[PDB]
Design a binder for this molecule. Structure first.
Ligand code: CL
Ligand code: CL
Ligand code: ZN
Ligand code: ZN
Lengths: 402, 400
């Protein structure tokens, strides 16, 4: 009987630089107008504040999150981080971890994300000889139970290395067969000790299940740049343009700048996408340079409260503040670039850009903020007012009401 | 018996949970259980209770001047020091005593809501501001004494040798009651390192005040300038009475320059403050701390023409430092917690009355987190803030 299922009144829209009413029917934005007349079931008044599309946390580890919790001090952080140690910690952990513990962590992680207005995430999940597909199974189960809260892509993740743990290949195939959405490895050079082999193997598996690729490349300096360049060239050779993401690419921060300058056309040609996580972005990462060159660069938590990262609130607005401090940004323009990173850049990384944004016909997945603008939100860190997924209110005043 | 009791307080220095009994502005008893009941109690419920945070470097006078539009004002252009100086001279031309006092009070309220109970603010003194900003700050200070303790640095923002009115104005500012004196960039602002430093000492000594110097200059010219400062500190009988703010040069100068200078800094008792709005990612924070250097922490500017950020929140500042510096271990987060607490106290000179021990001041923050590490990680809002043994903040409202 009624003209709109939901109307958000008085919404400041950063892309249009003005205040509008937003009219929603079902899971779709139907109308954006200075003032909407018509009958409506439910309304939310944004009161002139910013309303944003849902945030995108383009790289998480939901499977092993919150494992540092339960004592006065974070567990595991009596010692400094190294990749190989954190790998051994993970193999020890998954020996006895239960399906229910892992599913609980994934749900807790998702709840924390959605409370902060993240509506889309791409999680990695550990696949190795100890975890087997136990973690994958729990993640895919949770995913299904969370589908009214948050959209999740799952990367089948060969955390130990295809050429280090030889069971990885069979187990990743199974993980893909089970329904993982992407495949990925780690450090073709310093973990695998076999750049060409590891990358070729990832493409073989990807192609078998017709999935996209998200690769963890931590390696610094010229060995990092070399490894991403090999990845990018293989992307072209395999007919995989636009289907490959490189996570981290810390090497862009310490390799000679001329190495990045030479590789940019290759990245554009291959449609290589990137993710920088705010838990590790190097201070001298050329974020603004990448963005100005037209490179797709999303943003993410990475791990939350585990034996890799003790931090994490699953909050992209807090992450955006963290980036501005890491990178030493202040201008309104630069804060605006960070805001695109946690929104529309992420959407592009995830491949959802056609249905993402506050425009007519797009999905009604939205966050009403308590701040005036992207810049003021990053600065003031005000809590979210309301979160809307599939045109239904799922968070109101710091509670999940879905 | 007790005016206030905090129940079930985790104390990080003792690594256990205690009841805390308070009479007047003093902590009187710390025991596993305090027998009996009193009118005013706060239950920490096993979470951390901390001494009040110390924001060792602010600019309360010109805070919140970027506010009032959809986008922050001023930030259509990148920062440089000399441009921010011009912005400040333009702003203070017409800024009123009441606007400035209002911003100071807003800033204080924001700080105390996050559990900061002690701050050292600089205040612009130059030919345009004159002592108008000084006046307003001292006036707000007096009105805020039940909320927060404020030290005021008479700050020659434009340079003693660039704005020649600075000297006379700073003398007046001290006469009016500023607690400290300071300048900026002896080398690249003043173009006279010996002169500027000697002048600051002359003025300091006339009014028997401490020194807090802004030294942003990077690399070897920064280290040189801090070294000249520290030598002059010894020459002037000023050991322990001088702080150097920023010292960004420690980050990019050859590490052997800092290694050579450390004994000089220890000999001179030089104190330092690194502000979480600019700490360079390669600043050798942990190195300084392990060498026993006193290194406090601070907001610097909040929402103005120098820095667009700021929530006046030292716990958020601590998280920012861990990200700038790439820290993760429980030990390192512990060190950052000392920076926002007891290191600050030592910078400000209030260490004897600072801490959660019997006989110390009942200036306390009850957190909603288990531990210093968990508080930096989870960023939970403060539950209760106590100043001079009186509850001033409860659940995000100032109730004083
Ligand atoms: Cl950048
Ligand atoms: Cl009271
Ligand atoms: Zn990761
Ligand atoms: Zn300052």
């Amino acid at each position: 009987s009624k003209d709109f299922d939901l109307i958000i009144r008085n919404a400041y829209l950063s892309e249009k630089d003005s205040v509008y009413d937003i009219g929603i029917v079902g899971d779709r934005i139907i109308k954006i107008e200075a003032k909407i007349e018509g009958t409506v079931k439910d309304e939310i008044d944004a009161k002139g504040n910013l309303v944003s599309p849902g945030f995108v946390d383009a790289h998480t580890h939901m499977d092993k999150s919150f494992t540092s919790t339960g004592e006065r001090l974070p567990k595991f952080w009596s010692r400094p981080y190294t990749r190989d140690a954190a790998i051994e910690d993970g193999l020890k952990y998954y020996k006895n971890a239960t399906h229910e513990e892992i599913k609980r962590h994934v749900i807790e992680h998702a709840h924390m994300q959605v409370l902060h207005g993240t509506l889309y995430t791409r999680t990695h999940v550990d696949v190795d000889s100890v975890a087997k597909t136990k973690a994958v199974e729990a993640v895919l189960e949770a995913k299904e139970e969370l589908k009214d809260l948050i959209d999740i892509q799952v990367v089948a993740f060969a955390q130990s290395g295809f050429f280090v743990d030889l069971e990885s290949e069979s187990l990743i195939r199974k993980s893909l067969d089970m329904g993982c959405d992407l495949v990925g490895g780690v450090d073709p050079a310093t973990r695998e000790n076999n750049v060409e082999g590891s990358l070729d193997l990832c493409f073989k598996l990807a192609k078998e299940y017709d999935v996209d690729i998200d690769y963890h490349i931590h390696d610094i300096g010229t060995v990092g740049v070399y490894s991403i360049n090999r990845l990018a060239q293989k992307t072209i050779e395999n007919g995989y343009k636009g289907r490959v993401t490189t996570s981290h690419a810390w090497c862009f921060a310490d390799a000679p700048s001329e190495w990045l300058d030479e590789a940019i056309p290759l990245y554009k040609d291959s449609g290589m996408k990137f993710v920088t996580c705010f838990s590790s972005t190097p201070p001298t990462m050329p974020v603004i340079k990448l963005l100005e060159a037209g490179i797709n660069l999303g943003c993410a938590s990475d791990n939350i409260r585990d034996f890799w990262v003790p931090f994490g609130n699953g909050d992209m607005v807090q992450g955006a503040l963290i980036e501005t401090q890491r990178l030493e940004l202040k201008t309104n323009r630069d804060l605006g670039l960070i805001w695109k990173m946690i929104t529309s850049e992420g959407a592009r990384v995830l491949g959802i850009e056609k249905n993402y944004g506050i425009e007519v016909g797009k999905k009604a997945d939205l966050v009403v903020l308590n701040s005036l603008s992207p810049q003021w939100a990053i600065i003031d860190q005000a809590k979210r007012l309301c979160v809307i997924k599939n045109g239904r209110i799922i968070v109101k005043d710091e509670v999940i009401v879905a």
